[PDB]
Amino acid sequence: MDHYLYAINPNGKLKWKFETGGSVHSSPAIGQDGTIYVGSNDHYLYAINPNGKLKWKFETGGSVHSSPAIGQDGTIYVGSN
Amino acid sequence: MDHYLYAINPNGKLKWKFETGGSVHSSPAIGQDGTIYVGSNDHYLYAINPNGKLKWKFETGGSVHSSPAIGQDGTIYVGSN
Amino acid sequence: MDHYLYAINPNGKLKWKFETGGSVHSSPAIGQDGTIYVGSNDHYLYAINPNGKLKWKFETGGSVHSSPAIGQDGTIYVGSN
Amino acid sequence: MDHYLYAINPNGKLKWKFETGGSVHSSPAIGQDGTIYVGSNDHYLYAINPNGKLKWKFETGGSVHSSPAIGQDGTIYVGSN
């Protein structure tokens, strides 16, 4: 499979996709600085930069179907399976 | 099973329905000009006008479960299976 | 099973629950007038009043795991399975 | 499998994790005082402080897949299986 997070332009064209190690069921969230957070079936929560490069990957105990929330001070909240 | 994205008035009467290729697990998102986006299990991220006409669809490698998010500049982000 | 939509108070106590005909996997959305919209495994999208009584129920072709969006003019958008 | 709700800093380092009873499919939501809410497959809608301490949990009849929504007045809405 593909396992990618997609970033698509208003005109229908691709901007970038980013690869995780498993399927992306989480829905993306976007913090004040433009960072995109999303979970994967591969265990991690991923921080991707607006241009599509990894920022960091945090590792939890299981797959991530829960979708992140961002609180005022920038904390990212998400559950794990 | 149904497979549509439904537009329904606050009064409860249907406004329009747009048939996609498979079940819509994806929750829609609304951009600045009012375009509605939503994944489809037919592997596409769809984008609909406020009048039920297809604007465009973007082909992903797999089923799109993830619900899209929209950045400040209109970029549409979403994950695929 | 229960099939209910729950409305819980900041203090942990119950305000009301509402019964559908099947399981509630959709996540709720809230329109400007306080109306709560959510889907069910039983096929319908449900409009519930702030006090917990039905407002109307719209019927689609399949179960509703997609979660609704509300656009500016009050349209409710949701997919079906 | 993991079962936690994770709080992670914008820098990527863990802030706290709060163990719930089962997998967290539910996506969290953030209220006015900063309380984080989230369902759990252990049949509860949880509510966490910004410091990883349980505020309260509310027992539903079944697994809570739905992600909560919050009204103007702080009421927490959510659906159950």
Side-chain angles (χ1 to χ4, degrees):
Chain A
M1 272 60 141
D2 68 322
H3 314 129
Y4 288 94
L5 165 89
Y6 280 88
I8 283 122
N9 272 323
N11 61 17
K13 273 139 227 342
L14 178 86
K15 188 188 246 147
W16 44 261
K17 31 159 155 203
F18 177 88
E19 172 128 15
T20 88
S23 257
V24 167
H25 306 237
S26 203
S27 301
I30 314 199
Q32 273 141 108
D33 63 342
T35 306
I36 314 99
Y37 310 101
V38 67
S40 202
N41 281 182
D42 67 15
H43 275 47
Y44 298 85
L45 176 100
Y46 277 124
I48 308 309
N49 285 317
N51 62 2
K53 332 272 215 294
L54 172 77
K55 206 218 228 299
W56 44 254
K57 56 162 119 152
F58 182 101
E59 169 208 48
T60 60
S63 100
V64 179
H65 290 229
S66 175
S67 283
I70 305 124
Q72 300 205 207
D73 83 315
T75 306
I76 307 108
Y77 309 100
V78 72
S80 189
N81 247 23
Chain B
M1 224 202 280
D2 167 288
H3 299 186
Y4 284 76
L5 163 88
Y6 285 83
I8 280 140
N9 290 314
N11 72 2
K13 297 222 262 141
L14 172 80
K15 222 182 190 40
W16 45 253
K17 34 159 222 182
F18 170 84
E19 176 193 84
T20 93
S23 348
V24 205
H25 251 288
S26 198
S27 316
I30 320 178
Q32 239 167 273
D33 59 20
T35 323
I36 314 95
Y37 315 85
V38 79
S40 182
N41 269 10
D42 72 20
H43 304 359
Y44 282 85
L45 162 78
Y46 280 71
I48 321 292
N49 308 117
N51 66 3
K53 160 178 231 150
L54 162 88
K55 173 135 186 170
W56 51 251
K57 31 158 161 203
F58 182 88
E59 181 144 62
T60 39
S63 37
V64 184
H65 295 279
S66 199
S67 306
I70 307 161
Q72 291 224 17
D73 67 2
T75 313
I76 302 102
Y77 308 97
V78 83
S80 206
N81 268 15
Chain C
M1 272 60 141
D2 68 322
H3 314 129
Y4 288 94
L5 165 89
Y6 280 88
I8 283 122
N9 272 323
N11 61 17
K13 273 139 227 342
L14 178 86
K15 188 188 246 147
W16 44 261
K17 31 159 155 203
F18 177 88
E19 172 128 15
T20 88
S23 257
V24 167
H25 306 237
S26 203
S27 301
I30 314 199
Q32 273 141 108
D33 63 342
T35 306
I36 314 99
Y37 310 101
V38 67
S40 202
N41 281 182
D42 67 15
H43 275 47
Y44 298 85
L45 176 100
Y46 277 124
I48 308 309
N49 285 317
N51 62 2
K53 332 272 215 294
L54 172 77
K55 206 218 228 299
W56 44 254
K57 56 162 119 152
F58 182 101
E59 169 208 48
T60 60
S63 100
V64 179
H65 290 229
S66 175
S67 283
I70 305 124
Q72 300 205 207
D73 83 315
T75 306
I76 307 108
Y77 309 100
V78 72
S80 189
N81 247 23
Chain D
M1 224 202 280
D2 167 288
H3 299 186
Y4 284 76
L5 163 88
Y6 285 83
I8 280 140
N9 290 314
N11 72 2
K13 297 222 262 141
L14 172 80
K15 222 182 190 40
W16 45 253
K17 34 159 222 182
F18 170 84
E19 176 193 84
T20 93
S23 348
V24 205
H25 251 288
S26 198
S27 316
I30 320 178
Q32 239 167 273
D33 59 20
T35 323
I36 314 95
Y37 315 85
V38 79
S40 182
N41 269 10
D42 72 20
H43 304 359
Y44 282 85
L45 162 78
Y46 280 71
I48 321 292
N49 308 117
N51 66 3
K53 160 178 231 150
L54 162 88
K55 173 135 186 170
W56 51 251
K57 31 158 161 203
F58 182 88
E59 181 144 62
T60 39
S63 37
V64 184
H65 295 279
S66 199
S67 306
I70 307 161
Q72 291 224 17
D73 67 2
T75 313
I76 302 102
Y77 308 97
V78 83
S80 206
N81 268 15

